[PDB]
């Protein structure tokens, strides 16, 4: 009877952790793409932007 | 080979996999006497079916919440890709773009769109120089004590005579007054060399 409480707690904490991580990675990806854009457009040439 | 269109296959694979998991989830018991609801309702009284069915309700609730959350997260990648595609279409098809390595990998002339299932494909036409030769250069020339500089292109010399050429396609021309403009005097610049102008 008791062990189901611990299981339903820990599984929810783990789901919350994964849900944080997915958002944080999806944020990092846009900075990675902006870095790669600057690399490609402003080092290898002169940009009038 | 069809491996060219790998990208827009994995969106379908991921969607089908998620939907198959969401549907297969129904087979689990969550601690009830059966996964089948009529199997309970036929064998047991409402005082007990109302104890049992809450577990299945909570399970299927949290499963559908997890599915909806995953879809809500995944949608923003597709939106950012649609916006990037709209940008490429607005900027590189309707006009010539100077953003290096934005359209293809080289000097860009034009592009053409083609449709595809749940996607789009571009064809980029690009110009690239293949052959190149060795030349000797000087950044200016001296005549009558005045330093001459080129209006466009650069000075080059195979070793015997001096010529001016455009920068990206070898084409020699006789150094003539209206190819060049005058600044300062011979003493100020380094590397300048004596020559004749016509």
């Amino acid at each position: 009877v008791q062990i189901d409480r611990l299981i339903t707690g820990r599984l929810q904490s783990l789901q919350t952790y994964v849900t944080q991580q997915l958002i944080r990675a999806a944020e990092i990806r846009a900075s990675a793409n902006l870095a790669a854009t600057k690399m490609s457009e402003c080092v290898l040439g002169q940009s009038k932007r | 080979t069809a491996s060219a269109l790998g990208k827009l296959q994995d969106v379908v694979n991921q969607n089908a996999q998620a939907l198959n998991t969401l549907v297969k989830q129904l087979s689990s018991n969550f601690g009830a006497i059966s996964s089948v609801l009529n199997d309970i309702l036929s064998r047991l009284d409402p005082p007990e079916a109302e104890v049992q069915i809450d577990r299945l309700i909570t399970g299927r609730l949290q499963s559908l919440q997890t599915y909806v959350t995953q879809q809500l997260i995944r949608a923003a990648e597709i939106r950012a890709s649609a916006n990037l595609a709209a940008t490429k279409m607005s900027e590189c098809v309707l006009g010539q773009s100077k953003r290096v390595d934005f359209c293809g990998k080289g000097y860009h002339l034009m592009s053409f769109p083609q449709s595809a299932p749940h996607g789009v494909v571009f064809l980029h036409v690009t110009y690239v120089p293949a052959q190149e030769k060795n030349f000797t250069t000087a950044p200016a020339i001296c005549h009558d004590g005045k330093a001459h500089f080129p209006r466009e292109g650069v000075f080059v010399s195979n070793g015997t005579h001096w010529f001016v050429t455009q920068r990206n396609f070898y084409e020699p021309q006789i150094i003539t007054t209206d190819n060049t403009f005058v600044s300062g005097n011979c003493d100020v610049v380094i590397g300048i060399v004596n020559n004749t102008v016509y």
């Binding site: - | 060219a4 269109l5 990208k7 969106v11 379908v12 969607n15 939907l19 609801l37 309702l41 079916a49 109302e50 069915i53 809450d54 309700i57 299927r60 609730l61 559908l64 919440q65 599915y67 909806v68 879809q71 809500l72 995944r74 949608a75 597709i78 939106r79 890709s81 649609a82 595609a85 490429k88 279409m89 293809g104 990998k105 595809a116 749940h118 996607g119 789009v120 494909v121 571009f122 064809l123 980029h124 036409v125 690009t126 110009y127 690239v128 120089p129 052959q131 190149e132 030769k133 030349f135 000797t136 250069t137 650069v154 080059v156 050429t165 920068r167 990206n168 396609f169 070898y170 590397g191």
Partner: protein
């Protein structure tokens, strides 16, 4: 032995090539010729040097056109799910318990409807920016 762990059934080589399959820490593996699985340190490419000095340039004399494809995904399959048919399976004994959890299923439908409305915006804004249907001569 590697930084990543212990690898069984591959033969190390001092040579190096492009990387077909990655293992980690620069360690890479492949199937090659008398055929076996090898592992090696991934190469970064050829090595080159330019003869740079004052008063020397190279000018290109010839050129080639080229073409290059690019592929992007602009849409997703607009699935839809009935919350109460799934949860209760058209059982009234179920639904008179389910209606204690209030508006959850309805906001779920609302979320999915947003998806179903957003995706045909995605298809609408990429194409359909020409005001007239031209035709070829």
């Amino acid at each position: 032995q590697t930084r990543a762990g212990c690898l069984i059934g591959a033969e190390h080589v001092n040579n190096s090539y492009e990387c077909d399959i990655p293992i980690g820490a620069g360690i890479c593996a492949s199937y090659q010729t008398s055929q076996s699985i090898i592992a090696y340190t991934m190469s970064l490419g050829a090595e080159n040097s330019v003869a740079y000095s004052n008063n020397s340039i190279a000018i290109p004399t010839n050129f080639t056109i080229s073409v290059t494809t690019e592929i992007l995904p602009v849409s997703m399959t607009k699935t839809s799910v009935d919350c109460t048919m799934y949860i209760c399976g058209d059982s009234t004994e179920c639904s008179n318990l389910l209606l204690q959890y209030g508006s959850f299923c309805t906001q779920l439908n609302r979320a999915l409807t947003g998806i179903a409305v957003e995706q045909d915006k995605n298809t609408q804004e990429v194409f359909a920016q020409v005001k007239q249907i031209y035709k070829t001569p």
